[PDB]
């Protein structure tokens, strides 16, 4: 089983450095060419760097000067040393696999899970976690939610009752907002007749700034 | 340096069904291109490569052809795993080059959002803001028009909504619509109303409180 699998992702401030990892396993990494391919805001896919079986790297303008590919064979670890970072460098980072005869001029053929870079003045801020709370019918569904406000950078990730709770979970998109922070909801239905005696609680994380809330939704 | 262009942008299909995407390229390629598949918030899934070629793995129904410039992917029958945004890749001639990508989206009958409302917390009152959320869960279409009425008076300007991805057991939508407001302002007035007006509605449904 091929596994690609990236760290060394977070926040940056314009002109700063940062190095990225890529742990390779299930095949010879060395034999493989390997890729970096980011992904940015809009969703439109940008080839970053290549680097061939024979360490030989290869870059597109745009980064040519500031980002460096590398690679240690021996413990399996693809790089991207990014310099000089701007702001348009925000976006998920993944490498990627080559074929299997060892050039670069190749399809990407595994993935990593990503890892994300965000460049900006700003400091991490972490959310203010408010209750939606629920009101009811019998026979009917109540919803309830938690209003995830306020923090910068992205992502927030969010599970209700410690993960016990997944059925009927809908955690919204982030929306930016006119401050310039972001803020998303995450909604779960549920039975009304369960609203007194079954506990709601959202669990909140935010590891941009380590930021852990549980906040227990409560009827109105 | 090489442009990928996809046709459609997007589109609808039902189970079953036998989907082909296009992918074009502003140079001959000699069919060094691949297809692969991202489903919202996964790592990019090679499909095809060299063109024509089925990757490890992928199911039979998937196929590509093309030559040069133009080519194509097909899924002969449709699935319920084949939902995402499929991209095309060139890597002839450095840079390589993605297509802005297809988004395939699963066609189901129309569905009726059920609408809740959501008063500010306590909690953030005293913080000086007051959001108030309208939620729609669980419909089709994607299109759905949110009005916010403030004592009857319809608002402007200082809303926002976000959408979920196509639900992966029922394939319906959800939207989450949030009112902003000064705690000044939203103690200055009383009926707060979303109004939801939707297909699969007969009749615009209007979900309110009062602050009090
Ligand atoms: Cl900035």
Known sequence: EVKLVESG????????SLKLSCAASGFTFTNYAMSWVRQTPEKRLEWVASISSGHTPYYPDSVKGRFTISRDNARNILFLQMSSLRSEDTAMYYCARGDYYGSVYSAMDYWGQGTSLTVSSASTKGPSVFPLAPSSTSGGTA?????????????????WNSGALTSGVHTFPAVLQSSGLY????????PSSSLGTQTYICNVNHKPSNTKVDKKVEPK | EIRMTQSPSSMYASLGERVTVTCKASQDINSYLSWLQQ????????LIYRANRLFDGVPSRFSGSGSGQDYSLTISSLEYEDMGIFYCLQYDEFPFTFGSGTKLELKRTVAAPSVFIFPPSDEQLKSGTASVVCLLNNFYPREAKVQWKVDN??????????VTEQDSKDSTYSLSSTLTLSKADYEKHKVYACEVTHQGLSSPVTKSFNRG
């Open chain 1, 9 to 16: 992702g977070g926040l940056v401030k314009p002109g700063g």
């Open chain 1, 143 to 159: 919803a309830l939610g938690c209003l995830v406000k306020d923090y910068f950078p992205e992502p927030v990730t969010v599970s």
């Open chain 1, 183 to 190: 803020s998303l909801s995450s909604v779960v239905t549920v």
């Open chain 2, 39 to 46: 489903k919202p918030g996964k790592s990019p899934k090679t």
């Open chain 2, 153 to 162: 008076a319809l608002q402007s300007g200082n809303s926002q909504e976000s």
